[PDB]
mmCIF file of C-alpha atoms in Angstrom:
data_model
loop_
_atom_site.group_PDB
_atom_site.id
_atom_site.type_symbol
_atom_site.label_atom_id
_atom_site.label_comp_id
_atom_site.label_asym_id
_atom_site.label_seq_id
_atom_site.Cartn_x
_atom_site.Cartn_y
_atom_site.Cartn_z
ATOM 1 C CA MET A 1 -40.521 44.252 -43.725
ATOM 2 C CA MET A 2 -37.070 45.196 -42.380
ATOM 3 C CA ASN A 3 -36.288 48.802 -41.533
ATOM 4 C CA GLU A 4 -33.380 49.959 -43.697
ATOM 5 C CA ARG A 5 -31.927 51.995 -40.904
ATOM 6 C CA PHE A 6 -31.612 48.956 -38.649
ATOM 7 C CA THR A 7 -29.988 46.795 -41.338
ATOM 8 C CA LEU A 8 -26.286 46.802 -41.323
ATOM 9 C CA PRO A 9 -23.948 47.238 -44.340
ATOM 10 C CA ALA A 10 -23.412 44.360 -46.739
ATOM 11 C CA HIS A 11 -19.898 43.642 -45.460
ATOM 12 C CA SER A 12 -21.108 43.115 -41.878
ATOM 13 C CA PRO A 13 -21.128 39.264 -41.938
ATOM 14 C CA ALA A 14 -17.562 39.128 -43.236
ATOM 15 C CA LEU A 15 -16.584 41.579 -40.482
ATOM 16 C CA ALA A 16 -18.387 39.545 -37.861
ATOM 17 C CA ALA A 17 -16.530 36.445 -38.961
ATOM 18 C CA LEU A 18 -13.201 38.004 -38.083
ATOM 19 C CA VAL A 19 -14.153 38.269 -34.403
ATOM 20 C CA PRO A 20 -13.812 34.633 -33.195
ATOM 21 C CA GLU A 21 -10.617 34.121 -35.252
ATOM 22 C CA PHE A 22 -9.105 37.178 -33.603
ATOM 23 C CA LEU A 23 -9.905 35.861 -30.113
ATOM 24 C CA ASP A 24 -8.236 32.575 -31.110
ATOM 25 C CA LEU A 25 -4.876 34.023 -32.183
ATOM 26 C CA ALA A 26 -3.189 33.690 -28.803
ATOM 27 C CA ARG A 27 -4.145 30.048 -28.480
ATOM 28 C CA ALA A 28 -3.092 29.226 -32.018
ATOM 29 C CA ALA A 29 0.217 30.989 -31.376
ATOM 30 C CA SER A 30 0.831 28.798 -28.311
ATOM 31 C CA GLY A 31 1.302 25.662 -30.443
ATOM 32 C CA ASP A 32 -2.400 24.650 -30.929
ATOM 33 C CA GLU A 33 -6.621 23.842 -35.497
ATOM 34 C CA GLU A 34 -4.053 23.585 -38.338
ATOM 35 C CA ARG A 35 -4.002 26.504 -40.800
ATOM 36 C CA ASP A 36 -1.015 28.417 -42.113
ATOM 37 C CA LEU A 37 0.424 30.437 -39.202
ATOM 38 C CA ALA A 38 3.300 32.960 -38.882
ATOM 39 C CA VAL A 39 4.561 33.784 -35.379
ATOM 40 C CA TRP A 40 7.569 36.004 -34.627
ATOM 41 C CA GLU A 41 8.268 36.578 -30.935
ATOM 42 C CA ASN A 42 10.842 38.793 -29.205
ATOM 43 C CA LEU A 43 11.695 40.591 -32.375
ATOM 44 C CA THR A 44 13.814 43.675 -32.192
ATOM 45 C CA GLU A 45 12.225 46.481 -34.181
ATOM 46 C CA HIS A 46 14.865 48.864 -35.378
ATOM 47 C CA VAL A 47 12.806 52.013 -35.803
ATOM 48 C CA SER A 48 14.065 55.076 -37.583
ATOM 49 C CA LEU A 49 11.534 57.689 -36.588
ATOM 50 C CA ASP A 50 11.063 61.144 -38.153
ATOM 51 C CA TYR A 51 8.889 62.967 -35.573
ATOM 52 C CA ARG A 52 7.614 66.441 -36.434
ATOM 53 C CA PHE A 53 6.315 68.962 -33.900
ATOM 54 C CA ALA A 54 3.697 71.463 -35.093
ATOM 55 C CA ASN A 55 4.401 73.911 -32.267
ATOM 56 C CA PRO A 56 7.934 72.855 -31.643
ATOM 57 C CA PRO A 57 8.412 72.982 -27.872
ATOM 58 C CA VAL A 58 6.037 70.151 -26.783
ATOM 59 C CA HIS A 59 3.794 67.471 -28.364
ATOM 60 C CA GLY A 60 0.306 68.553 -29.457
ATOM 61 C CA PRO A 61 -2.471 68.142 -32.032
ATOM 62 C CA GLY A 62 -1.169 68.638 -35.544
ATOM 63 C CA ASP A 63 2.096 66.840 -34.852
ATOM 64 C CA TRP A 64 2.915 63.978 -37.185
ATOM 65 C CA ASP A 65 5.499 61.380 -37.932
ATOM 66 C CA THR A 66 6.752 58.836 -40.364
ATOM 67 C CA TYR A 67 8.908 55.916 -39.578
ATOM 68 C CA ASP A 68 10.642 52.990 -41.176
ATOM 69 C CA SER A 69 11.184 49.776 -39.276
ATOM 70 C CA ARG A 70 13.249 46.664 -39.600
ATOM 71 C CA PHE A 71 12.134 43.461 -37.861
ATOM 72 C CA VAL A 72 15.165 41.440 -36.713
ATOM 73 C CA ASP A 73 14.621 38.106 -34.953
ATOM 74 C CA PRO A 74 16.707 37.042 -31.908
ATOM 75 C CA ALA A 75 19.381 35.373 -34.083
ATOM 76 C CA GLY A 76 19.962 38.538 -36.161
ATOM 77 C CA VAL A 77 17.912 37.543 -39.232
ATOM 78 C CA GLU A 78 15.831 40.354 -40.728
ATOM 79 C CA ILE A 79 12.334 38.910 -41.266
ATOM 80 C CA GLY A 80 10.510 41.952 -42.656
ATOM 81 C CA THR A 81 10.154 45.713 -42.695
ATOM 82 C CA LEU A 82 7.478 48.312 -42.000
ATOM 83 C CA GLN A 83 6.510 51.795 -43.124
ATOM 84 C CA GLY A 84 4.374 53.727 -40.667
ATOM 85 C CA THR A 85 2.669 57.088 -40.456
ATOM 86 C CA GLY A 86 0.929 58.823 -37.558
ATOM 87 C CA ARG A 87 -0.870 62.072 -36.803
ATOM 88 C CA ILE A 88 -1.976 63.632 -33.511
ATOM 89 C CA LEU A 89 -5.638 64.482 -34.061
ATOM 90 C CA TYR A 90 -7.101 65.496 -30.666
ATOM 91 C CA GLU A 91 -6.912 65.522 -26.868
ATOM 92 C CA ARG A 92 -9.384 63.435 -24.863
ATOM 93 C CA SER A 93 -11.988 65.368 -22.897
ATOM 94 C CA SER A 94 -11.551 63.270 -19.776
ATOM 95 C CA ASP A 95 -7.751 63.485 -19.400
ATOM 96 C CA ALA A 96 -6.308 65.409 -22.389
ATOM 97 C CA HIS A 97 -4.309 62.367 -23.550
ATOM 98 C CA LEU A 98 -2.872 62.754 -27.046
ATOM 99 C CA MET A 99 -4.847 60.655 -29.556
ATOM 100 C CA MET A 100 -3.136 59.631 -32.745
ATOM 101 C CA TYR A 101 -4.192 57.721 -35.740
ATOM 102 C CA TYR A 102 -1.619 55.432 -37.351
ATOM 103 C CA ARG A 103 -1.463 53.461 -40.584
ATOM 104 C CA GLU A 104 1.295 50.923 -41.323
ATOM 105 C CA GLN A 105 2.350 48.601 -44.136
ATOM 106 C CA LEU A 106 4.274 45.463 -43.193
ATOM 107 C CA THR A 107 6.413 43.967 -45.990
ATOM 108 C CA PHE A 108 7.698 40.417 -45.660
ATOM 109 C CA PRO A 109 9.757 38.609 -48.293
ATOM 110 C CA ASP A 110 6.648 36.654 -49.233
ATOM 111 C CA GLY A 111 3.884 39.189 -48.807
ATOM 112 C CA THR A 112 2.324 42.229 -47.205
ATOM 113 C CA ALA A 113 -0.051 43.151 -44.423
ATOM 114 C CA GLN A 114 -1.452 46.405 -43.107
ATOM 115 C CA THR A 115 -2.449 48.087 -39.901
ATOM 116 C CA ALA A 116 -4.461 51.158 -38.877
ATOM 117 C CA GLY A 117 -5.838 52.395 -35.606
ATOM 118 C CA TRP A 118 -5.707 54.586 -32.533
ATOM 119 C CA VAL A 119 -2.696 55.021 -30.265
ATOM 120 C CA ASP A 120 -2.719 56.944 -27.023
ATOM 121 C CA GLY A 121 0.338 59.164 -27.537
ATOM 122 C CA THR A 122 0.416 60.054 -23.872
ATOM 123 C CA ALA A 123 0.679 56.403 -22.876
ATOM 124 C CA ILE A 124 3.537 55.618 -25.326
ATOM 125 C CA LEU A 125 5.693 58.147 -23.451
ATOM 126 C CA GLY A 126 4.841 56.221 -20.281
ATOM 127 C CA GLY A 127 6.215 53.045 -21.929
ATOM 128 C CA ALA A 128 2.966 51.044 -22.332
ATOM 129 C CA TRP A 129 2.700 48.074 -24.655
ATOM 130 C CA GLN A 130 0.699 49.017 -27.742
ATOM 131 C CA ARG A 131 -1.214 46.544 -29.903
ATOM 132 C CA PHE A 132 -2.515 46.919 -33.459
ATOM 133 C CA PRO A 133 -4.690 44.443 -35.351
ATOM 134 C CA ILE A 134 -3.326 43.314 -38.721
ATOM 135 C CA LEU A 135 -5.101 42.449 -41.932
ATOM 136 C CA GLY A 136 -3.099 40.519 -44.494
ATOM 137 C CA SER A 137 -3.000 42.304 -47.881
ATOM 138 C CA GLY A 138 -0.891 40.269 -50.260
ATOM 139 C CA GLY A 139 1.022 37.071 -51.009
ATOM 140 C CA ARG A 140 1.213 34.459 -48.250
ATOM 141 C CA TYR A 141 -0.561 36.788 -45.777
ATOM 142 C CA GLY A 142 -3.450 37.821 -48.015
ATOM 143 C CA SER A 143 -5.803 35.413 -46.277
ATOM 144 C CA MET A 144 -4.586 36.247 -42.766
ATOM 145 C CA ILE A 145 -5.476 38.357 -39.748
ATOM 146 C CA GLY A 146 -3.191 39.015 -36.849
ATOM 147 C CA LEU A 147 -1.821 41.095 -34.047
ATOM 148 C CA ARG A 148 1.219 43.324 -33.671
ATOM 149 C CA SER A 149 2.323 44.024 -30.089
ATOM 150 C CA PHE A 150 5.199 46.361 -29.485
ATOM 151 C CA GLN A 151 6.794 48.230 -26.617
ATOM 152 C CA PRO A 152 9.401 51.031 -26.912
ATOM 153 C CA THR A 153 12.605 49.923 -25.198
ATOM 154 C CA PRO A 154 13.578 52.040 -22.154
ATOM 155 C CA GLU A 155 17.154 52.546 -23.428
ATOM 156 C CA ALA A 156 16.164 53.943 -26.826
ATOM 157 C CA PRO A 157 12.394 54.535 -26.852
ATOM 158 C CA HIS A 158 12.639 56.160 -30.291
ATOM 159 C CA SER A 159 14.816 53.564 -32.096
ATOM 160 C CA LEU A 160 14.457 50.053 -30.612
ATOM 161 C CA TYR A 161 11.168 48.389 -29.800
ATOM 162 C CA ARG A 162 10.438 44.897 -28.605
ATOM 163 C CA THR A 163 7.855 43.384 -30.981
ATOM 164 C CA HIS A 164 5.724 40.260 -31.357
ATOM 165 C CA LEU A 165 3.721 39.500 -34.521
ATOM 166 C CA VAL A 166 1.192 36.780 -35.218
ATOM 167 C CA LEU A 167 -0.672 36.222 -38.466
ATOM 168 C CA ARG A 168 -2.934 33.354 -39.117
ATOM 169 C CA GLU A 169 -4.818 32.121 -42.167
ATOM 170 C CA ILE A 170 -8.602 32.346 -42.102
ATOM 171 C CA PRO A 171 -10.135 29.606 -44.310
ATOM 172 C CA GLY A 172 -10.960 31.259 -47.638
ATOM 173 C CA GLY A 173 -9.519 34.585 -46.417
ATOM 174 C CA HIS A 174 -11.000 37.525 -44.634
ATOM 175 C CA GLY A 175 -12.585 38.596 -47.892
ATOM 176 C CA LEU A 176 -11.973 42.339 -47.702
ATOM 177 C CA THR A 177 -10.568 44.368 -50.584
ATOM 178 C CA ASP A 178 -12.320 47.736 -50.346
ATOM 179 C CA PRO A 179 -10.258 50.164 -48.235
ATOM 180 C CA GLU A 180 -13.503 51.332 -46.616
ATOM 181 C CA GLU A 181 -14.323 47.860 -45.350
ATOM 182 C CA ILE A 182 -10.701 47.116 -44.439
ATOM 183 C CA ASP A 183 -10.678 50.239 -42.271
ATOM 184 C CA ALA A 184 -13.959 49.130 -40.695
ATOM 185 C CA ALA A 185 -12.513 45.700 -39.892
ATOM 186 C CA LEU A 186 -9.456 47.292 -38.316
ATOM 187 C CA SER A 187 -11.685 49.498 -36.183
ATOM 188 C CA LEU A 188 -13.763 46.455 -35.154
ATOM 189 C CA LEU A 189 -10.763 44.423 -34.071
ATOM 190 C CA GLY A 190 -9.062 47.456 -32.486
ATOM 191 C CA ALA A 191 -12.027 47.679 -30.124
ATOM 192 C CA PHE A 192 -10.454 44.779 -28.198
ATOM 193 C CA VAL A 193 -6.916 46.178 -27.911
ATOM 194 C CA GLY A 194 -7.014 49.921 -28.524
ATOM 195 C CA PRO A 195 -7.360 52.872 -26.184
ATOM 196 C CA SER A 196 -10.712 54.390 -25.388
ATOM 197 C CA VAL A 197 -11.388 57.155 -27.856
ATOM 198 C CA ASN A 198 -13.242 59.522 -25.492
ATOM 199 C CA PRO A 199 -14.220 58.127 -22.071
ATOM 200 C CA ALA A 200 -17.236 59.637 -20.362
ATOM 201 C CA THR A 201 -16.151 62.588 -18.234
ATOM 202 C CA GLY A 202 -17.528 63.840 -14.930
ATOM 203 C CA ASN A 203 -19.506 66.834 -16.081
ATOM 204 C CA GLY A 204 -21.540 64.897 -18.710
ATOM 205 C CA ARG A 205 -19.809 66.885 -21.520
ATOM 206 C CA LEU A 206 -17.182 66.381 -24.156
ATOM 207 C CA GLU A 207 -15.694 69.809 -24.057
ATOM 208 C CA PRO A 208 -12.122 70.382 -25.183
ATOM 209 C CA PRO A 209 -9.315 70.482 -22.613
ATOM 210 C CA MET B 1 2.076 28.453 -23.275
ATOM 211 C CA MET B 2 0.437 31.677 -24.394
ATOM 212 C CA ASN B 3 2.075 35.020 -25.013
ATOM 213 C CA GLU B 4 0.565 37.594 -22.667
ATOM 214 C CA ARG B 5 0.937 40.084 -25.493
ATOM 215 C CA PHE B 6 -1.237 38.099 -27.927
ATOM 216 C CA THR B 7 -3.944 37.512 -25.295
ATOM 217 C CA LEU B 8 -6.937 39.773 -25.451
ATOM 218 C CA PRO B 9 -8.516 41.340 -22.362
ATOM 219 C CA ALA B 10 -10.826 39.287 -20.156
ATOM 220 C CA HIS B 11 -13.876 41.094 -21.457
ATOM 221 C CA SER B 12 -13.233 39.925 -25.024
ATOM 222 C CA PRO B 13 -15.725 36.992 -25.055
ATOM 223 C CA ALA B 14 -18.582 39.177 -23.786
ATOM 224 C CA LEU B 15 -17.735 41.772 -26.445
ATOM 225 C CA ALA B 16 -17.626 39.028 -29.070
ATOM 226 C CA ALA B 17 -21.033 37.797 -27.902
ATOM 227 C CA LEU B 18 -22.561 41.150 -28.727
ATOM 228 C CA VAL B 19 -21.726 40.795 -32.445
ATOM 229 C CA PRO B 20 -24.300 38.212 -33.698
ATOM 230 C CA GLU B 21 -27.070 39.880 -31.651
ATOM 231 C CA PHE B 22 -26.230 43.255 -33.171
ATOM 232 C CA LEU B 23 -26.423 41.733 -36.651
ATOM 233 C CA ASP B 24 -29.818 40.271 -35.677
ATOM 234 C CA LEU B 25 -31.467 43.562 -34.633
ATOM 235 C CA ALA B 26 -32.955 44.467 -38.073
ATOM 236 C CA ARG B 27 -34.642 41.093 -38.450
ATOM 237 C CA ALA B 28 -35.838 40.993 -34.856
ATOM 238 C CA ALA B 29 -37.508 44.423 -35.145
ATOM 239 C CA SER B 30 -39.470 43.344 -38.225
ATOM 240 C CA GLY B 31 -41.366 40.708 -36.229
ATOM 241 C CA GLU B 32 -36.332 33.956 -31.055
ATOM 242 C CA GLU B 33 -38.685 35.600 -28.533
ATOM 243 C CA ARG B 34 -36.975 37.966 -26.120
ATOM 244 C CA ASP B 35 -38.089 41.278 -24.735
ATOM 245 C CA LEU B 36 -38.001 43.793 -27.594
ATOM 246 C CA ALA B 37 -38.721 47.513 -27.852
ATOM 247 C CA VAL B 38 -39.080 49.180 -31.283
ATOM 248 C CA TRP B 39 -39.899 52.840 -31.886
ATOM 249 C CA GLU B 40 -39.978 53.785 -35.579
ATOM 250 C CA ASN B 41 -40.528 57.194 -37.194
ATOM 251 C CA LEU B 42 -40.260 59.063 -33.936
ATOM 252 C CA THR B 43 -39.951 62.827 -34.065
ATOM 253 C CA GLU B 44 -36.989 63.895 -31.944
ATOM 254 C CA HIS B 45 -37.393 67.400 -30.566
ATOM 255 C CA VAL B 46 -33.853 68.646 -30.008
ATOM 256 C CA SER B 47 -32.806 71.613 -27.879
ATOM 257 C CA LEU B 48 -29.151 72.378 -28.675
ATOM 258 C CA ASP B 49 -26.512 74.428 -26.788
ATOM 259 C CA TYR B 50 -23.629 74.889 -29.282
ATOM 260 C CA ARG B 51 -20.228 76.385 -28.332
ATOM 261 C CA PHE B 52 -17.721 77.628 -30.915
ATOM 262 C CA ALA B 53 -13.973 77.669 -30.584
ATOM 263 C CA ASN B 54 -13.353 80.327 -33.278
ATOM 264 C CA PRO B 55 -16.764 81.845 -33.304
ATOM 265 C CA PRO B 56 -17.565 82.615 -36.965
ATOM 266 C CA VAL B 57 -16.086 79.260 -38.087
ATOM 267 C CA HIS B 58 -17.478 75.741 -37.666
ATOM 268 C CA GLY B 59 -14.325 73.814 -36.754
ATOM 269 C CA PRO B 60 -12.268 71.620 -34.439
ATOM 270 C CA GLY B 61 -12.805 72.700 -30.851
ATOM 271 C CA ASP B 62 -16.507 73.391 -31.253
ATOM 272 C CA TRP B 63 -18.627 71.296 -28.918
ATOM 273 C CA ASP B 64 -22.223 71.131 -27.795
ATOM 274 C CA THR B 65 -24.778 69.695 -25.376
ATOM 275 C CA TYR B 66 -28.382 68.952 -26.141
ATOM 276 C CA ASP B 67 -31.692 67.681 -24.764
ATOM 277 C CA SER B 68 -33.964 65.492 -26.823
ATOM 278 C CA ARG B 69 -37.583 64.465 -26.665
ATOM 279 C CA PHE B 70 -38.811 61.301 -28.385
ATOM 280 C CA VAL B 71 -42.393 61.775 -29.617
ATOM 281 C CA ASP B 72 -44.138 58.964 -31.474
ATOM 282 C CA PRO B 73 -46.401 59.712 -34.488
ATOM 283 C CA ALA B 74 -49.464 59.999 -32.214
ATOM 284 C CA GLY B 75 -47.844 62.805 -30.162
ATOM 285 C CA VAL B 76 -47.042 60.703 -27.102
ATOM 286 C CA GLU B 77 -43.572 61.202 -25.628
ATOM 287 C CA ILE B 78 -41.900 57.803 -25.127
ATOM 288 C CA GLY B 79 -38.557 58.992 -23.743
ATOM 289 C CA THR B 80 -35.867 61.655 -23.628
ATOM 290 C CA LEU B 81 -32.127 61.956 -24.278
ATOM 291 C CA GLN B 82 -29.158 64.074 -23.181
ATOM 292 C CA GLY B 83 -26.193 64.266 -25.519
ATOM 293 C CA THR B 84 -22.773 65.805 -25.927
ATOM 294 C CA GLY B 85 -20.549 66.046 -28.978
ATOM 295 C CA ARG B 86 -17.245 67.560 -30.007
ATOM 296 C CA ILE B 87 -15.578 68.391 -33.281
ATOM 297 C CA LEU B 88 -12.190 66.746 -32.995
ATOM 298 C CA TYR B 89 -10.410 67.058 -36.330
ATOM 299 C CA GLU B 90 -10.563 67.293 -40.111
ATOM 300 C CA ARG B 91 -10.019 64.048 -42.058
ATOM 301 C CA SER B 92 -6.824 63.922 -44.093
ATOM 302 C CA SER B 93 -8.595 62.483 -47.128
ATOM 303 C CA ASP B 94 -11.356 65.050 -47.601
ATOM 304 C CA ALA B 95 -11.206 67.498 -44.636
ATOM 305 C CA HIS B 96 -14.597 66.376 -43.362
ATOM 306 C CA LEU B 97 -15.261 67.474 -39.797
ATOM 307 C CA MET B 98 -15.042 64.399 -37.574
ATOM 308 C CA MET B 99 -16.951 64.438 -34.343
ATOM 309 C CA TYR B 100 -17.659 62.159 -31.374
ATOM 310 C CA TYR B 101 -20.885 61.898 -29.356
ATOM 311 C CA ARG B 102 -22.057 60.396 -26.086
ATOM 312 C CA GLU B 103 -25.712 60.193 -25.126
ATOM 313 C CA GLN B 104 -27.921 59.023 -22.290
ATOM 314 C CA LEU B 105 -31.391 57.653 -23.062
ATOM 315 C CA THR B 106 -34.170 57.757 -20.423
ATOM 316 C CA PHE B 107 -37.430 55.866 -20.769
ATOM 317 C CA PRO B 108 -40.198 55.742 -18.109
ATOM 318 C CA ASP B 109 -39.117 52.152 -17.299
ATOM 319 C CA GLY B 110 -35.344 52.368 -17.661
ATOM 320 C CA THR B 111 -32.170 53.749 -19.184
ATOM 321 C CA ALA B 112 -29.732 53.179 -22.024
ATOM 322 C CA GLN B 113 -26.652 54.831 -23.459
ATOM 323 C CA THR B 114 -24.944 55.605 -26.725
ATOM 324 C CA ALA B 115 -21.604 56.714 -28.153
ATOM 325 C CA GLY B 116 -19.976 56.979 -31.548
ATOM 326 C CA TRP B 117 -18.466 58.909 -34.424
ATOM 327 C CA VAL B 118 -20.195 61.422 -36.685
ATOM 328 C CA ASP B 119 -18.997 62.898 -39.990
ATOM 329 C CA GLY B 120 -20.199 66.449 -39.328
ATOM 330 C CA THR B 121 -19.809 67.380 -42.990
ATOM 331 C CA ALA B 122 -21.888 64.508 -44.369
ATOM 332 C CA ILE B 123 -24.661 65.093 -41.826
ATOM 333 C CA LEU B 124 -25.302 68.458 -43.483
ATOM 334 C CA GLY B 125 -25.675 66.468 -46.752
ATOM 335 C CA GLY B 126 -28.630 64.482 -45.334
ATOM 336 C CA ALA B 127 -26.974 61.150 -44.451
ATOM 337 C CA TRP B 128 -28.438 59.036 -41.645
ATOM 338 C CA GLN B 129 -26.424 58.767 -38.418
ATOM 339 C CA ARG B 130 -26.350 55.535 -36.448
ATOM 340 C CA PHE B 131 -25.001 54.801 -32.915
ATOM 341 C CA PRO B 132 -25.090 51.464 -31.140
ATOM 342 C CA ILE B 133 -26.950 51.429 -27.813
ATOM 343 C CA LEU B 134 -26.135 49.620 -24.581
ATOM 344 C CA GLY B 135 -28.894 49.329 -21.986
ATOM 345 C CA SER B 136 -27.879 50.654 -18.572
ATOM 346 C CA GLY B 137 -30.911 50.363 -16.287
ATOM 347 C CA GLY B 138 -34.371 49.040 -15.649
ATOM 348 C CA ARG B 139 -36.176 47.107 -18.320
ATOM 349 C CA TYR B 140 -33.377 47.762 -20.741
ATOM 350 C CA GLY B 141 -30.347 46.882 -18.598
ATOM 351 C CA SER B 142 -29.977 43.535 -20.379
ATOM 352 C CA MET B 143 -30.390 44.963 -23.854
ATOM 353 C CA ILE B 144 -28.420 46.140 -26.847
ATOM 354 C CA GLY B 145 -29.841 48.140 -29.717
ATOM 355 C CA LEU B 146 -29.410 50.703 -32.434
ATOM 356 C CA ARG B 147 -30.285 54.397 -32.722
ATOM 357 C CA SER B 148 -30.626 55.841 -36.217
ATOM 358 C CA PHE B 149 -31.543 59.457 -36.837
ATOM 359 C CA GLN B 150 -31.530 62.015 -39.615
ATOM 360 C CA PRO B 151 -31.728 65.778 -39.145
ATOM 361 C CA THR B 152 -34.826 67.174 -40.784
ATOM 362 C CA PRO B 153 -33.806 69.355 -43.799
ATOM 363 C CA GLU B 154 -36.192 72.218 -42.855
ATOM 364 C CA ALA B 155 -35.109 72.247 -39.147
ATOM 365 C CA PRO B 156 -31.746 70.460 -39.000
ATOM 366 C CA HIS B 157 -30.861 71.577 -35.455
ATOM 367 C CA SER B 158 -34.172 71.118 -33.718
ATOM 368 C CA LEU B 159 -36.174 68.292 -35.422
ATOM 369 C CA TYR B 160 -34.885 64.824 -36.309
ATOM 370 C CA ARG B 161 -36.543 61.736 -37.732
ATOM 371 C CA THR B 162 -35.507 58.855 -35.487
ATOM 372 C CA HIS B 163 -35.715 55.063 -35.164
ATOM 373 C CA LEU B 164 -34.776 53.114 -32.024
ATOM 374 C CA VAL B 165 -34.533 49.386 -31.359
ATOM 375 C CA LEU B 166 -33.401 47.688 -28.129
ATOM 376 C CA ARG B 167 -33.486 43.924 -27.653
ATOM 377 C CA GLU B 168 -32.882 41.588 -24.749
ATOM 378 C CA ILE B 169 -29.681 39.542 -24.862
ATOM 379 C CA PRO B 170 -29.798 36.143 -23.110
ATOM 380 C CA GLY B 171 -28.413 36.769 -19.658
ATOM 381 C CA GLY B 172 -27.728 40.461 -20.266
ATOM 382 C CA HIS B 173 -24.817 41.950 -22.095
ATOM 383 C CA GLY B 174 -22.660 41.555 -18.985
ATOM 384 C CA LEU B 175 -20.879 44.905 -19.101
ATOM 385 C CA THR B 176 -20.753 47.194 -16.088
ATOM 386 C CA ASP B 177 -17.303 48.798 -16.071
ATOM 387 C CA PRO B 178 -17.166 52.013 -18.127
ATOM 388 C CA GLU B 179 -14.045 50.882 -20.006
ATOM 389 C CA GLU B 180 -15.658 47.681 -21.210
ATOM 390 C CA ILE B 181 -18.823 49.567 -22.136
ATOM 391 C CA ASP B 182 -16.749 51.992 -24.204
ATOM 392 C CA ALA B 183 -15.039 49.078 -25.916
ATOM 393 C CA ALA B 184 -18.384 47.436 -26.698
ATOM 394 C CA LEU B 185 -19.728 50.713 -28.077
ATOM 395 C CA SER B 186 -16.613 51.099 -30.243
ATOM 396 C CA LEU B 187 -16.876 47.487 -31.387
ATOM 397 C CA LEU B 188 -20.500 47.858 -32.475
ATOM 398 C CA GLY B 189 -19.870 51.315 -34.004
ATOM 399 C CA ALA B 190 -17.333 49.755 -36.401
ATOM 400 C CA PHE B 191 -20.413 48.432 -38.269
ATOM 401 C CA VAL B 192 -22.331 51.735 -38.473
ATOM 402 C CA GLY B 193 -19.878 54.582 -38.090
ATOM 403 C CA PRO B 194 -18.058 56.703 -40.633
ATOM 404 C CA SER B 195 -14.456 55.988 -41.570
ATOM 405 C CA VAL B 196 -12.304 58.084 -39.215
ATOM 406 C CA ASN B 197 -9.295 58.714 -41.469
ATOM 407 C CA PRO B 198 -9.367 57.024 -44.890
ATOM 408 C CA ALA B 199 -5.988 56.393 -46.484
ATOM 409 C CA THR B 200 -4.658 59.144 -48.762
ATOM 410 C CA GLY B 201 -2.848 58.980 -52.087
#
């Protein structure tokens, strides 16, 4: 008797199950429920960033970048690396902030994890902390979700970031393999940490700036 | 003691509380007793003001506003809607036109609102579009719901087939600030929206 158009996709329960675990990460990271946990705090992210302008003089839609990162802990030990890609897709109606979609692959000696989501490009210039959700994708991290928080250092905003990473096992894993559903989970969790995609304006319209 | 940078914003528990209720909407609409409003197989009469950025081309920069009338099968109007949408970009994977919409719902006894992503290319193809709803006034202020519509193939820009459900949440959804409302609408849209930029080869 259920209306098809009110029923949600098959993966929705698995998605929903990520939500409480995500809210729990901070507490689990603070020393503590015992599952496998990986916490790296006060990392130095050595970023080598190839930033391309589409209309060279100033940032705008169409711009893109790639970057490679090295995660080095306070003692100088490299704990993992990262490949990232980003594209500027549009300007918000309300304030013309530069909206960018990013995807990243984190590679640790014992496994891999991935990231995707929205970044306010205007805010990164201003020096804001950014946060991406993580889904584990292989090895030790395959059963894990987490959070990546990074801030571009004032001295070298394009080469050194300060970064914290937390990944935590979910019992029996998050259960997502399809890229479609992985992207949906990353959108769901990003809702808590990511910028607003297009805030309501004054004039009741979403016209372009 | 906790890392500020791993701690989620204060609204996170209220957002999290929306999730099981949202998953419960389909079952609730088909018959726990709360206040519930279901309108199925409405005819949505749409009046559309569409602006082009490069006039002959449908593309990024286009935007529109529209007025909608919800008429039940018996010909009674049960509410109206004002909406706005913009074409923001073409997906890397398949160049589909991605768009974003915000809408305000007005019923005789209250108000509700909507926002979310639309694949403008797939909508041509006859796919259903779905936006989460947050109540914003009157009877519905304490409610969340779902709006699903499909443009009629014979009159794709003026007639839609539409279903609406809104359901009371115990103690209201608890969101008043626009930023938290936008986050809740994004959170619930993750379940129903198109993929915004699928990974490429």
